């Protein structure tokens, strides 16, 4: 559960960080 | 091969390695395919679509029926297109316009290509854009390049009509000097 939560968190985080470009 | 191609090209050995370098840099010698043209030829075309045109001269380059043939097959054609003769450069561009691969080009056959060019141009033509011009831009072809006045141009019927406009031979050979 923790693994998947961190997974989704870093997922949308990377998505936003990519959108920064 | 290096020398098996050196005995075929119009370039020297250093002029061959200098392109082998850049080729193997981007492509791990798999083979350059449409996937490479539709990007590098497109990345060179902001405000313009290069794929609609690259789609033709890819398979025009590929003497084989494959979709990713060879770097040797790339440089042998580069030699012709840069430091080749007008007679074979025009044969190559005819094979380009001969989308049917037969040796007989129709009005709409190369209209399919002048549309690709006009699309590669940009989003809006800087003068007024009329979609009849890519129709009539083919007519100005045939009225000079269709000696039979029939509407279908073949190999010699295009060549013997593509050697009198001195300006085009002035234009076909502008790039055989760059190094």
């Amino acid at each position: 559960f923790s693994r998947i939560y961190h997974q989704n968190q870093r997922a949308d985080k990377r998505r936003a960080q990519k959108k920064a470009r | 091969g290096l020398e098996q191609l050196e005995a075929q090209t119009n370039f020297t050995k250093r002029e061959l390695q200098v392109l082998y370098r850049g080729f193997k840099n981007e492509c791990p010698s798999g083979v350059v395919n449409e996937d490479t043209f539709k990007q590098i030829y497109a990345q060179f075309f902001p405000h313009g679509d290069a794929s609609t045109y690259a789609h033709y001269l890819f398979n025009a380059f590929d003497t084989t029926q494959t979709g990713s043939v060879k770097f040797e097959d790339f440089v042998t054609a580069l030699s012709i297109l840069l430091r080749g003769t007008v007679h074979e450069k025009l044969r190559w561009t005819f094979n380009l316009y001969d989308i049917n691969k037969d040796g007989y080009i129709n009005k709409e056959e190369m209209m399919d290509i002048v549309k690709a060019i006009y699309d590669m141009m940009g989003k809006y033509t800087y003068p007024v854009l009329k979609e009849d011009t890519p129709r009539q831009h083919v007519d100005v072809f045939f009225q000079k390049m269709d000696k039979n006045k029939d509407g279908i141009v073949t190999l010699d019927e295009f060549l013997e009509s593509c050697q009198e406009d001195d300006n085009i031979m002035r234009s076909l050979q502008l790039f055989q000097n760059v190094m």
């Binding site: - | 200098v18 001269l57 290509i113 831009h137 100005v140 502008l174 790039f175």
Partner: protein
């Protein structure tokens, strides 16, 4: 002939041949030929460690130290070498970048040294190739973490 940034321009000059037949133009622009010379192995002297690279590779990013010409202050004309009094390892990172054009981050580098050498080469830490990017951010945040009246306010001082 040319290479590097103009390594694939010959392919474009080959493709341009397809226009001329249908090109009803009276006269296009004559070619833009200019001064040409073959490339050579400019030698980078990083602490005796010897590197060699074509100018074409060196000039893909003239907005930085190597692409620009203010690199000659480290160029030891006595040796034809750009001598650099720096790390012989993080240099390899910048160099393999210039080869690729993308940035990598080795796992075990003191991010302080990393970023300071990046700025030293003018390269921006923001442009790290996402091949290995977020762990650089992790080193970033961890390092940031770790690096962190007479009577009327002497009372305050004694409080806290």
């Amino acid at each position: 002939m040319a290479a590097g940034v103009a390594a694939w321009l010959p392919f474009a000059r080959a493709a341009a041949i397809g226009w001329m037949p249908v090109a009803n133009c009276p006269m296009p622009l004559a070619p833009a030929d200019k001064n040409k010379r073959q490339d050579e192995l400019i030698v980078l002297n990083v602490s005796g460690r010897r590197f060699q690279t074509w100018r074409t590779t060196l000039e893909r990013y003239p907005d930085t130290l190597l692409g620009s010409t203010e690199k000659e202050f480290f160029f030891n004309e006595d040796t034809k070498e750009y001598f650099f009094d720096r790390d012989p390892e993080v240099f390899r990172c910048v160099l393999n970048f210039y080869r690729t054009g993308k940035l990598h981050y080795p796992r075990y580098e003191c991010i302080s040294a990393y970023d300071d050498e990046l700025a030293f080469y003018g390269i921006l830490p923001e442009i790290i190739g996402d091949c290995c990017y977020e762990e650089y951010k992790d080193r970033k945040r961890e390092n940031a973490e770790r690096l962190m009246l007479s009577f009327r306010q002497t009372m305050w001082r004694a409080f806290e």
